Structure formats: C-alpha cells, structure tokens
C-alpha cells in the first residue's frame, strides 16, 4: 500500500528532524539573524548561498550538507549564466522545494531535512526580509518574522511570540534569540547574520569574542 | 523418587504447569525430583533458576577402568572358564577372570 | 549506577544505548532468591570454618551471583514488557544485549 | 521497515569492529602517537595522508584499507588541484564521514570499520592536535585527547583516562599508551608518530631497535 | 540473514578445498620447494608469477586458474609500469586477498580455492623465503616455514612439524615433502622449486628422470 | 538447497545426452579415427578445428554446432595472432573445458554436450595421439586410446576395451570401432580420420565408396 508507506516516510522524516538541536532564524534592524544550537566547532548549520541569501538547516548533518552543496552550486552557476542580482531567494527556496518533493517521493529513504531560505535587500535599497521555510514534504511556507527549525518548536516558536519586536537592534534580537532558544555559550553557539548593510557579500560570522561582546 | 527421564525432547507451554507443581511439591521434601537429560543446552534455563533444581551433577562414560569394573560385575568368577586358559594361570579363577577382563578391554580399547 | 552492577545493554530506534542496572528490575523474588543464595553460602562457610554466623560479606557476594545465574528478566529479541518500557522511554527499544572463516579482522 | 533494517546493520558492524585489535591515538608533546596491537608485518592499521594527516583504523582490513587508498586519492588530488597547505584533517575527516554514511544506507553489508583521522600543526607553527573519530553511522566526534578504536573500548578509555598528561613526552606517551592498551613487544606492536617537528612530512614509523628503546 | 549466507558460504568453499588433492611448499636451502599430487600431465597446480614469485594452489582448478591468470596480468603490468624489482609477493598476496574477498561476498558462489603465494631473494642476495596462504574468505597468513593446502590439511601438517629442518637440501626436502604427503612416483607428482641462485627467472620445473633421481 | 538444484541440473544434462546417438574415436597406426552414428547428410558429428586437431561430440546439436564455431574461431585467430604450429589440441579443451563450465554454472540450461578433442603429431613427426574429453560442467579427462560419447556408453566402452589393438590398421580400427558402436552401412555413418600422414591439414573425410570399400 503506497498510502501507508508514505505515512511511515512522513513519521519517519518528522522524528529525526525532532531527534535534532534547534535553529532560529528572525528579521532585526540590519538584516536576519542565524542562531543556532550547535557544539562542534567544524560542523556547521548556517550558510552563505549567494551575495545577499542565507541558509539554515536542522536534520541529518550529510543530508542537509548536500542541499547546501547543491544549493550553492545552482546559484552561482545562474548568477555566472545571467547575472549576481538576478539570483534571488525566492528561486532557491523554489528549487529546494521540489528537491525535497522528489527525494520525499523517489529515494528509498526520505531527506529528514528542515531548511530555511532568507534573504534581504542590496546595499543602499530598502526591502522588507523574507523567510522561506521548505519543509521535507517539500511545501514552502513563507514567514513574516521568524522561523524555528527542528527539535521541539512549539516552546520556542511561542517565547519568540511574546518577545519578538521588528528593528531590534543586533544585541536585543540575539538576547530574543538565545532566550526563546533556552525554552548557552560562545561554545556551544553558531551565530551568524545577513547584514543589509554590507556592500555585496551580506552573510557574516559572529564567533569568539565579538559574539561574547554582543551576546 | 519421582524420575522424569529424556527431558530433552520437551522444553505458553507445558512449563509453567510443571514449575507449579514442583513449588506445590516442596512443602514434601521427603519426595526428591530427579530429572535426566542429554542435551543440557536445549533445556530451558526456567528450570535451571535457582530455587527448585539447584543441584545439577554431570555423567560419563565407562572409562576403561569402569570398562573393567562392568565387566567384572556380569563376568563374576561363577562363570565356567576354558581349561586352556587356566593352564595360563595355573587354575587361578580370579586371576583368569582379571586378565580376560583386562584383555577385552585393552582390546576394545584400542 | 557503578558498572559493577550492569545488567543489560538497550539500544533504542534512535540509537542511544543505554545500560539498566538491576535498579530497573528488583522483584521480590529476586530478593527472596538473593537471600536464599545468600544463606547457601552462609552453609557453605560455616560447614568450612565451624563459625555460626552469618557475613554482610555474603550477601555482598550473593547479591552478583545472583545474576551469574538467568532469572527470566531478559528476553531474546524484543520482548512485550520492553515494549512497554520503551512506551515509557518514548523509543522503540531495537537490541536486547547481556553485559573462524569469515573474512579478515585488523 | 526502515527502524529494523536500517538499524540492522548497526548490531552487524558494532560486532564486526568488536571481533578485531585495539588501536590508540592521543596528543603528545611533540604531536601525535598512534599505538596499533598488530602481530603481521606486513598488513598495517596506520597511516600517512596527507603531510600533516595521518590515520588509523579498526575493523574488516579489506574495508579500512579500501578507505585507506580512497583518502590517499583525495588528498593528493586536492594538493595538486589546489595546494599542499589547503588539505586539512578536516575535510578528510567529513568525507569519510559522508562515504561511510553512503555505504551505511546503501550497500549491501556496512563497513565493520571505526576510522580517527589525525592532524598536527605546519613545521614552526603552533596549534594544538586535532583527533576525529568516524564511526559505521556516519557519525563524526571531536576527541581533544585520545581516541579509542577496536575490540572492548571501556577498560583502554579507562586506563588512559587516569594516565593521560598533557604535553608527555614521546616516552612517557608510549609507555602510557602500551599500559592502558594491556587493560606487548615490538613483535606484536605497530607504532608510528606525527612529528610535528618535521619540516614536511610529518608522519614517521617507530620500528625495530628504535622502538626497542623507546619502549 | 548476513550471519547464514556467512555460515553457508563459508561451509562449502570448505566442502571444495578438502574435496581435492593436496599442495605442500617449504623452505630449504635453495629457496622454496613446491610438491603436489597431481596426475594429469596438462593441468598444474603450481605456476611461475614473477621473476622470485611463485604461486600454488588447491581447489576447482578452473577458478585458481582464473586467479593464476590474472596474478600474471597483475604482475607483468606492475613490473612494466614501474620495474621488476618493484613487484613483491607481498603485492600479490594482498591482491588475491582483495579479490577473495570481493568474490566471496558478490559473487554467486565464493571460490572454492586454497591460494599460497611464495617469494625468495634475488640473486647474490641474501633475505629469508615468505610463504603467504590466501584463503576463500580472503584472510592472509604469514608462514615460516610451510604451507599446506587442500585436501586433509591436519594429517599432513603434523608429518611436516616433526621432519622440517631449516637449510636442508634439495632432496631432504624433497623426501620430508613426498613422506609427509604420503600420510607416488613421477608420474603422479609436480614438482616446482624457487632457487634462489638463478640470476632472474627462479622458478624451476623437476620433472621426467631428474625428478626420478631426486627421489 | 542450491546443490540439490545442481543434481538436477546434472540429471538434466545427462538425460539429453542420452537422448541421442553414439560416437566414437580411437587411436590407430596412421593417427585417431573417429565413427559416428548418424543419419542425415547434412547435420555432421566431427568435424575440423585446425591443422592437426579434431572434433567430435554427442548431445544437442545446435550447442554443440556453436561450441564447433566458437572453437574455429579460437583457433584460427590464434593460428594467424602467432602462428599454426602454436595452436594444441590441449589449448582447445582447456577452452572448451572453461566455457562449458562457465555456461554450466551461469546460462539458464546446461549445454547437453559431450565433446572429444583429438590432436596428431604433426608431418614427419613421431608423437602420440592424444585424445581429450569434456563433460558438460567442464571436467576434462584424459584418454590414451579411446573415446566414447553420448547414448548407453558402457557396451560400446567394453567392447572396445576387448577390441582394442595399438598400431591397428584403419580397416582394422574400422571393424572394431563399428562393431563396439553396435553393441550400420556408409547410409548411417559419419566417418573421418586424423591422418598423422598428411602434410598440413590431417582432417579427411572417408564416404560414399572409399568408405564402402574401406568396411
């Protein structure tokens, strides 16, 4: 029976994006901000995809390493093909959406993978952020502020309810960020964002004792 | 003396039945529960908990002393002997009957 | 909750493998079979020694030798009461575990 | 089913690197100290990677091997392709993890094989020893002191838990690692060490009367 | 079941190497000597490799034929690739290692063959003859002073254990051999040697009314 | 049980070559004779295979029609690829002892064939003939006076055990090969020679009143 299959794929990919830490990822003042729940020090959950499109992923570490691989191949060769302003997070979100569809739906096993796609505005332009989360089943849900991905989201999505404000500055939006993550050290933090500010490459690393300043 | 022998061949089965009437028996010490089996492995280990069948003891074969020993207890010194054989032993009956042992044995065992 | 103690090795569908002691599986007749094991070899060094007395010593022993022997508390497989615990546990339990010619090992 | 099948093979390979010989690598003064229970001569569980990379392994030899040789061919072709200075433990160490994955959720029998990939610091440099371990999952861990590979891991773990010191010279480390791995001569024993004082090639065999004397 | 098809596998390779006539190699003084009972005149049982590399074997003689044939390939496109003095029996051991292992777990049925690869030392040079035993499964092991495959191995080896002496000649080992195989005249015998003293080619054939006079 | 399947595979075999009529082939003073009980015209047992090598065989004609062609084939590219006198009658029943085994084990249906590979002394030359037989799983035997393929082959193996004479004229070999095979006239006999006489090609055909006169 394909109906019941699919079932035990579906109930198979939500425990093991449930059997994984968490990621927040919430529009602030200069951009979206990246914060997640991450002990290695190689290892990492967050990424550049383009100049100005981030990525954060909770699942299986290989599997969403290779939609990151994937990802960051597809836009560099559309931004060579056409040009760099052309490649925007919407196609991204878009390719990895059926991505998953087709894993979900051809691979033995499917992809226990959560992704989120942001991205912000060019330099000197003014454009609201957008989130894009893009599910294993492969639906994309498009968020307003904020997108928490694997482990138990519901305590976490409701304290970022409660203490969300849109212009946070950096400082507030990461206390927001590691208290509704609470529901953690410069050790145990990935802390990245997409500052709008920056002239071309947006995404930018906050580790070690610039993170323990703001954090 | 209850004796249950060829236990091998059996053991939500008869199990627990006979678990309860060994712990129903054991008020009557006097009864003793003997059991044989062959296959010490096939037996399940419910029986072998401590508790009811604590005491378990190993056999063997006759070895060719214990050859010796059964043959002597059929072969007892009664039986007729072959004159040609006491002129070995100058009409010795149990020295006859001891190297006719011996010799069988040495020779089955060989 | 020392490893001297260990009883069995669960590992579960997510895969976390976890040791449980006796802790997890004290019955009464596990302690009426302690302390019967116990007296035994209180029979055992007074029939050696001439004391009539009984050690802590003995118990201490016995309460290890209690399990050298099977009681029935593991089960081949995945058994119905694991099913149970593992409700409780919120994983499947996968691998009950106690605590040649085939190809090359380095 | 995916919980039973998939998970089949964990007890399959657990037992398969339990059934081999105990190898060991930690951190020492001078870099790293792999210290294999070896008896052949000619088959060996330690090896050269890269200049700075070395590795060790535990379980069925045609598998560890076979990742032996594939390791050697990455490495060199990314030192040609790139440079020399641009391999790192690092990268080595994440596609063993994702081959051993790939072959986890793939092939027919999963490798009986537990991998550490080493790495030290560039001659005149300082930085402090990396351990990996990859394990049949996938899995990927960062040890800071010493890794643990084959046979019965607890008592040798243990063992070196209580003896490690760091910054213990080659003797000492040696003599540290011969007693926790007893929890044997130089006929029986496989040493070799990453000499972080070489100019280049970092990795370098203890055999023979040397060893005799280190020992 | 991975453990039955092991069980099952590995009980009839078993149940073809002890169905079949029996190979002996040994050191003595000139290098190595190869005796086994063989009565057909066309098919051989021990074979040339390489220069100082010899090669027996015992089972289903298309199958070790198979592996002679390719030991051949292997070796010459080693020695023409890189030089003669380059290929070892140490190589070639590990190879057929390599492809028992591959055949026994891949293909249809494992072969049922006992493989043993034998070297000795160029010429005016002076090292002690290997002797390798490459088994169905595909483990190697490393034997000092002989090899025995094929047929009942264990009444054999006791023979050879009480008579082998080290440095005896051509025809001490030659009597010891035939004896301990005994436990047949020239025209049920192939009999081969590696002698050390040729200046390349080392291996020998002993047939006809030399072979009659040696025995 | 797969062996169990391979008796039947073994049965099946042998059920066609019984299914079938006899051949014969023996030594004689002017090389081998070969005698065939066969009724067409067309359709022909024995046949050429090089310079001083022939061929017979018993079972499913078209099988062993195509081994007929496979082993024209080998030969004829060995012949030209080095030279005539390199190609043996025992390089082709090896071949044909490897294919047979191949398709034994792995085709569907096992070739329901017996053949016989004879082979002469060349012109001029003194040697023995040598007559090869293999069975349909590749097994190969050696004869030094005759051989007897397909039907009840025990009666007509007797007789010529009695009859059997060496250095027996070709009239006389004729008798006693057609009087074993009845245990027929020139309308139901397929007859030829290896003629060790003939300069280049021995292979000769012996029909119609020749073979009239000859029995």
Redesign the interface.
């Known amino acids: 029976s394909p109906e019941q299959a699919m079932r035990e794929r579906s109930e198979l990919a939500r425990k093991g994006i449930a059997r994984a830490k968490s990621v927040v990822a919430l529009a602030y003042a200069g951009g979206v901000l990246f914060v997640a729940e991450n002990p290695s020090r190689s290892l990492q959950k967050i990424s550049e995809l383009y100049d100005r499109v981030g990525f954060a992923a909770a699942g299986k570490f290989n599997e969403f390493d290779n939609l990151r691989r994937g990802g960051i191949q597809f836009a560099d060769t559309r931004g060579y093909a056409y040009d760099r302003r052309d490649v925007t997070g919407r196609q991204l979100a878009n390719v990895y959406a059926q991505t998953l569809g087709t894993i979900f739906t051809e691979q033995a096993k499917p992809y226990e993978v959560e992704l989120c796609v942001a991205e912000v505005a060019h330099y000197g332009e003014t454009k609201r952020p957008e989130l894009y989360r893009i599910t294993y089943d492969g639906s994309i849900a498009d968020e307003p502020h904020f997108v928490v991905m694997g482990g138990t989201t519901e305590p976490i999505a409701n304290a970022l309810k409660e203490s969300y404000a849109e212009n946070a500055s950096l400082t507030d939006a990461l206390r927001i960020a590691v208290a509704a993550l609470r529901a953690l050290g410069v050790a145990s933090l990935e802390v990245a964002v997409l500052d709008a500010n920056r002239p071309r490459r947006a995404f930018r690393r906050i580790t070690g004792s610039a993170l323990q300043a703001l954090l | 003396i209850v004796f249950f022998d060829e236990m091998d061949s059996i053991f939500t089965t008869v199990v627990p039945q006979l678990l309860s009437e060994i712990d129903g028996v054991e008020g009557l010490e006097n009864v003793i529960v003997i059991g044989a089996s062959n296959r010490e492995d096939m037996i399940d280990p419910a029986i072998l908990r401590p508790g009811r069948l604590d005491v378990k003891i190993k056999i063997e074969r006759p070895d060719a002393e214990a050859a010796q020993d059964i043959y002597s207890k059929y072969l007892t010194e009664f039986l007729p002997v072959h004159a040609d054989d006491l002129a070995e032993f100058d009409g010795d009956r149990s020295a006859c009957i001891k190297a006719m042992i011996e010799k069988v044995v040495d020779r089955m065992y060989a | 909750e020392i490893?001297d103690n260990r009883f069995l090795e669960v590992?579960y569908?997510?895969?976390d493998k976890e040791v449980m002691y006796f802790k997890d599986f004290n019955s009464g007749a596990m302690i009426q079979?302690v302390v019967?094991?116990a007296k035994k070899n209180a029979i055992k060094s007074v029939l050696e020694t001439g004391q009539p007395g009984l050690r802590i010593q003995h118990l201490l022993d016995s309460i290890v030798d209690?399990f050298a022997?099977?009681?029935?508390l593991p089960n081949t497989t995945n058994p119905d009461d694991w099913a149970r615990i593992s409700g409780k546990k919120g994983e499947?339990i996968?691998?009950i575990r106690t605590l040649s010619?085939?190809?090359?090992?380095?």
Chains 1, 4, 5, 6 share one sequence.
């Open positions: 490893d590992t569908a997510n895969g079979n019967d094991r209690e022997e099977n009681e029935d499947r996968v691998y010619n085939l190809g090359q090992y380095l």
